Structures are given as structure tokens and as C-alpha cells.
Write an enzyme that holds these catalytic residues in place. Structure first.
Site, PDB file in Angstrom:
ATOM      1  N   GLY A 164      -8.496   0.008   2.178  1.00 19.45           N
ATOM      2  CA  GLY A 164      -8.259  -1.198   3.025  1.00 19.45           C
ATOM      3  C   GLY A 164      -7.610  -2.124   3.598  1.00 19.45           C
ATOM      4  O   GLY A 164      -6.443  -1.532   4.635  1.00 19.45           O
ATOM      5  N   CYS A 165      -6.717  -3.148   2.684  1.00 20.72           N
ATOM      6  CA  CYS A 165      -5.416  -3.575   2.825  1.00 20.72           C
ATOM      7  C   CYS A 165      -3.978  -2.801   3.101  1.00 20.72           C
ATOM      8  O   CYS A 165      -3.450  -2.434   4.124  1.00 20.72           O
ATOM      9  CB  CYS A 165      -4.844  -3.981   2.168  1.00 20.72           C
ATOM     10  N   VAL A 166      -3.724  -1.164   2.271  1.00 23.66           N
ATOM     11  CA  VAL A 166      -3.020  -0.218   1.992  1.00 23.66           C
ATOM     12  C   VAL A 166      -2.970   0.529   3.501  1.00 23.66           C
ATOM     13  O   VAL A 166      -1.934   0.480   4.338  1.00 23.66           O
ATOM     14  CB  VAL A 166      -3.095   1.291   0.674  1.00 23.66           C
ATOM     15  CG1 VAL A 166      -2.186   1.838   1.249  1.00 23.66           C
ATOM     16  CG2 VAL A 166      -3.308   0.214  -0.423  1.00 23.66           C
ATOM     17  N   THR A 186      -2.288  -2.193   6.572  1.00 23.66           N
ATOM     18  CA  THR A 186      -0.356  -1.774   6.865  1.00 23.66           C
ATOM     19  C   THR A 186       0.482  -0.597   7.155  1.00 23.66           C
ATOM     20  O   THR A 186       1.288  -0.349   7.258  1.00 23.66           O
ATOM     21  CB  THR A 186       0.094  -2.775   4.849  1.00 23.66           C
ATOM     22  OG1 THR A 186      -0.128  -3.761   4.729  1.00 23.66           O
ATOM     23  CG2 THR A 186       1.479  -2.278   5.037  1.00 23.66           C
TER      24      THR A 186
END
Lengths: 208, 208, 208, 208
Positions: free
Chosen positions: B148-150, B153
Site C-alpha cells: 500500500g503506502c510503502v 511512496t
């Protein structure tokens, strides 16, 4: 708990309540990604014909249809670290056939093309402004590849304030594994995974 | 040809030539993602401890260490379509314990926290400006969740002009499948997947 | 040719055809900019009362009302080169009175506040996503200062795909010169400069 | 107190401590802005010649030299509200002479050109990524017009994490008033206003 139970309890996988101002984004159906003579390409023949049907309908209904392509000037190549990892992308030079939109998409002279330098169609591009400027509320994302440019575009679309639909039969990739993995993540977190049949019926419905 | 041969021919999987101005990005190791009392969380016990080692060394060497968190005002909830799909994220409210950075990371009083509203730490945030402003050339990305966020990013870091390293033992997810699929995509297209041992040795080497 | 003739022939100064989904952006009416005890402040008393009237009407009509503030963590100060030029801004620290929205604006608990690190309310912030997510087509920009944060926000708003209105009597600055210069540039290139009376009548009209 | 004392007390007008990785940004010295046959243009004869000196030295020292231009596809015109206000810009079409970089700048075949749709060279463009990817810390901004695209680019450069130098003799505008007002705002808030003589000496000094 099973994975399904974990994702459900975490509040993922909800349906999107579709808006009434659709736009079609065709991500990187350029020859570099669709013509197997080029190292970076995949078989996208079926996907492009489904996408053509969607675009033909949307265009006729006066909904925005926007194509993207990755293209570089020679001087940009050493400046962008993405090209260190994904070095095959350096072949996508302005003025080459690789950067041209595949005619199988049915692209017409009227259709806007946005040139980008990374994976996401929104990153470092005018795409968000075109969608906001046309009061778009819902985007349909198609193109190549599912795990790369398509998934990146989908994440950015929802982050940018647009509801997202992804017809799986309009998304091409180099391998089944990454294709399936990205469609799973999208369905859980970012948009509704569906098919072109649904999209076509839906577009007719909003016009009606 | 095999998947391995296809990705090789397409120019993916090249190593990153590491720079000499490192920064650490710790993505969403907030209690909302690390404390299993919350349904959005995953077991990040080992990952936070390994991340703490990296952050402690980087901080001592005066390399930027930046933590991210997702936090919302109640008024923002109906405005952001990401929250329709991933409705569990609406629990991440300003003033709540869910949005606070987990102390297991070793976060110090003067470590910068960036608040964001989506998946990528770069999207709609000051992150790129902080990194460019410190002449950062290489980021080490850690946190939750891998898929997800990793991942989001990591894609944005390389697109933004930073080389990317991802120590896999510092990344947590709520399921194995998405974790591995994201690490694969990253290793192929966006950055170098490695481990904390390598990062620690590398940081000392640039310091020398 | 006179300056007026030059700008006219260059195609500047056209009126904006207003949309039907308004939002109010209140730029940096924080105490740091409105309370004369602070070095960075201006007299904004009249401007805030006009802005309060606009916001009260818009809020009651269920149009988005969004406030912005500049706030820094101590560790961010050396990272951002804007603070080298504009060093007075370093006083705007989280947890200080300087960063709080001035009560004279009539801000209510429901009202979303967006924290930013530069001049433009859109730069490195979630603002574009909130406006796109609420299907906003027209923004009214107010705040401090006309030549700084307001003008920057106005340029970004039109660039982002939104039509822009600026009530001059809602914009405060440190000096008349820069105030007048920015209103001129805005009227020519970026938005329609008008007054609060117009805005109020217009908001009632779109609701009707 | 006087305007000078107000800006001093507010912490504006501090000098930039220059970095050691320069880049040159040449903003919209396209024929559309430099050839007086077009109503959007200004006399930039002297400015382009001084910009050429800076670019020639920078290129010889292997510092990035990046040119920007505004260009539209016909389909984009009704999508972008900037073009409602500044309708003269709609003449800047792909394939036209208006969008080509003026050869008086000395532009070379391998110099990077960034195409953008708004005022700022950073907005919806790959510019920040190129600069971060080359570890640039200081930009020299030149071009047309001072009060429009130049100013917007300067604001975005500093917001994006780059220190900014603006040689005034390299900036052209269609009127004196807006030119001087923008240079004032920049000198106070965003970068150091100087001249080409200083830039040339400075570039050689960092090379030494």
C-alpha cells in the site's frame, strides 16, 4: 482470520458509487508497449480492441478521452533515476515509432495525448488539470502494463479526487502474476475492477 | 521465453548506483497500522525494531529521518474518494492515538512528521521539498504496508528524482501475497530491495 | 501602443464565466499574519469581517469552505530554502498561537484546515484533491497577503483547473504597492478581481 | 514605520547562500513570446543574448540547462480555465512556430525542453524531477515574462526546495510596472535578484 477476513475488517473492498461525469484514460498503449518487436512490449491486441470500443462510445458521448505516452529527450535520460532501474524505457525517444499511440486503439486526431516521464499518468503531467477543468468525477483506466503504469495511474487518480473504474480486459501486462496482484490491490484499496461490457452499459446509462 | 527472460530483455532489474546523501523515510508506522487493537493494523514488531536501528544511525550521521502518518479532519472524509474504497482509513483522525507514530520506531522529539491524506508519502505533501532542500539523492523506504503506502511512496520517490532502497525486513503487510508481489515489482522497476544489515553497513560507508 | 492596448491585443483580461459549484479558500488568516504583535502581521480587520460574511453564507449553502495556515516543525526549518529568504516565517511553529486561525474569520469546528509549508495553498498540500473530490469548479480566494500567499494560491487554482474569483476587499497586504500590482496581474492573467458584495449576491444566485 | 522597515521586521530580503550544483532554467523564450509579429510577444533581444552567455558557460561546465515552452493540443484548449482568462495563449499550438525556442538563446540540439500548460515551469511538468535527479541545489531563472511565467517559476523553484537566483537583465516583460513589481516581490520573498555579470562570475567560481 483468513486474508479475506483481515481485509474486510480493515474496511477494504467497498464498491464505488459512480459519478455522472466520466473520462477515459488510456495509459501507454504506444507501440513500445504493444508491438512485440520491441523489448518493452506485451501482447495487448484483445485489450486494445476492448479499449477502442470504450473510447469510441465515450468520444461520441462527448466525455473526455485522453491517451498517455512515455517519451524522452536524449538529455533527460541521465537525469531520471527511474531509467537506471527500468533501462528499457530509455528506448522511448521523441520522434521514434516507440512513442506513437498504437492505431489499434482507434485514436483520432482530436484525441489529446499527454506525454509523461514516469509510471503514473498524473505525475509531472497536466492530467489532473484536464480532468478538473472538464469537471470529471469518475475515470476509467485502461492500458499497459497493469502492474506498472496502469496501477500507478489508478493510485494517483483516486488520490487526486476521482472515483476509479478499471476494466480488467482492457489492461495488458508482461506476466499473469503481477497483473493479478495489482488488480487485487486495486479492488481492495483504490478502485472497482470490472470489465468493458459493464463500462459500455454504464456509459450509455449516464448519457441517458 | 520465461518471465525472468521477458523482464531481463525489457531492461528491468538493474542495480541502483547509490548516492552519497541518504535520507530515511518511515511510512505510516503509526499505532493505526502497528497496534493490533485497530483493524487497520499489522504485526510490525520486528520491522519497527530494525527500522529503529537504521533511523538511529542516520540521525547520528545527520542524514534526514522523516516519518509519515495518515490523518484526517472529519470534514475531509466525505471529500476524498480514497476513503470510499478504503473506509477503514476514516478512523485515522487528528487527535486520536491511531495517527501517532509508534514509539517502537525510536522517533525523537525533533524528527519531522509529514501528514498526508493518501497512500504515497509524496502525494499532496511537502516531502519532495524537504528532500530536495537537503540535497538528498538516495532514500531508504520503510514502513506499513508493503503493498500500500510503502509501494506508493517508492514509486513516487523514484519518479521525483531520488534513488530508492527498500530493506524488506523493515516493511510490514497484512498478508504475504501482496507483500511479495510489491517487493517483486519494486526490485524490477523502482528500486533495490535489500535488508537492514546492508543499509546499516552502507550508511557507515558513506559516512567514511 | 499603451500598456492597456498591449495587454488587450495579447488576449488578457477576459471575464470568467462562473461555474455552479463554488468553494471558498481562506488563505493564511492566522494570527501570525493578522495580529500586529507579530512581525509578520498586517492589519486585516476589515478583510476578515468581509471574509466571515462570505464563509458564513457559503457554509450555510453547503459549499466547501477551506482555511489554510503555514506551520512548521522545528526540524523542517533548515530543510526549506524559502525560509532562508523569508526568515520571519520560521516563527510559525506547530503549537504556537501564530499558526492558529484568527477567530475574527468566524472559523467553526467543522471547517477543514490545510497546513502548508510554502506560499501557494495548493503546493505540497491536499487542497486540489479536496476541490476535485467535491466537484468544485469555481474558487473564491481571500486572505493574506495579496502579493504573497494569495497571489500564489490564485495562480495555482487556475493552473489546477478551477475558475478563480478574488474579492479585493478580502485580501490584506503589508503595503499598497505589491497589493495593487498582484491584483492587476490576477485581473489580466489568472482570475476575476471583484468585491465581497458581488460574491455574496453570486453565491445566493447559484444556490437559487 | 516605512515599507522598508515593515519588510525588514517581517524577516524578508535575506541573501541566498548559494549552493554548488547550479542549473539554468530558461522560461518560455519561444518565438510566441520573443517575436513581435505575435501579439503575445515582447522585445527580448538583449535578454536572450545575456541568457545565451549564461547557458553557454553552464553547458560547458556540465550544469543542466533546461528550456521551457507553453504548447497546446487543440483538444486541451476548452479544458484549461487559464485559457479563458489569457485567451492569447491558445495560439501556442503544437507544430506552430510560436512554441519553438528562439535560436537567439543559443539552444543546442541536446538541450532539454519541458512543455507545460500553465505559468509555472514546475506545474504539471517533469522539471522538479530533472533537478532533483541531477542533485541541483541552486537555479538561475531567466525568460519571459517577468511578471508571469518567470515569477511563477521562481515561486515554485523555492517551494520545491531549490535556492533561486534571477538575473534581471535576462528577464523580459511587456510593461515596466509589472516587471519591477515582480522583481521586488522576488527579492523580498523568493530569491536573489542580480544580473548576468554576477551569474557568470559565480558559475566560474563554483567550477573552480
Amino acid at each position: 482470520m483468513s486474508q479475506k477476513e483481515v481485509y474486510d475488517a480493515a474496511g477494504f473492498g467497498n464498491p464505488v458509487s459512480r459519478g455522472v461525469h466520466p473520462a477515459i484514460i488510456v495509459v501507454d498503449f504506444s507501440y513500445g508497449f504493444t508491438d512485440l518487436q520491441y523489448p518493452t512490449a506485451s501482447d495487448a491486441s484483445l485489450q486494445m480492441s476492448r479499449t477502442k470500443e470504450i473510447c469510441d462510445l465515450a468520444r461520441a458521448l462527448e466525455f473526455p478521452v485522453i491517451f498517455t505516452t512515455i517519451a524522452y529527450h536524449p538529455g533527460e535520460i541521465p537525469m531520471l533515476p527511474w531509467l537506471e532501474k527500468s533501462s528499457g524505457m530509455a528506448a522511448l525517444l521523441y520522434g521514434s515509432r516507440l512513442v506513437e499511440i498504437d492505431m489499434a486503439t482507434g485514436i483520432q486526431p482530436n484525441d489529446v495525448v499527454v506525454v509523461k516521464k514516469g509510471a503514473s499518468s498524473f505525475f509531472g503531467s497536466t492530467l489532473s488539470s484536464l480532468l478538473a477543468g472538464t469537471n470529471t468525477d469518475t475515470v476509467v483506466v485502461t492500458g499497459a502494463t497493469t502492474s506498472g503504469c496502469v496501477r500507478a495511474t489508478v493510485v494517483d487518480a483516486v488520490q487526486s479526487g476521482f472515483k476509479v473504474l478499471v476494466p480488467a480486459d482492457c489492461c495488458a501486462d508482461r506476466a499473469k502474476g503481477p497483473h493479478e496482484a495489482s488488480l487485487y490491490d486495486i479492488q481492495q484499496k483504490y478502485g472497482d475492477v470490472t470489465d468493458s461490457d459493464d463500462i459500455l452499459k454504464w456509459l450509455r446509462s449516464v448519457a441517458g
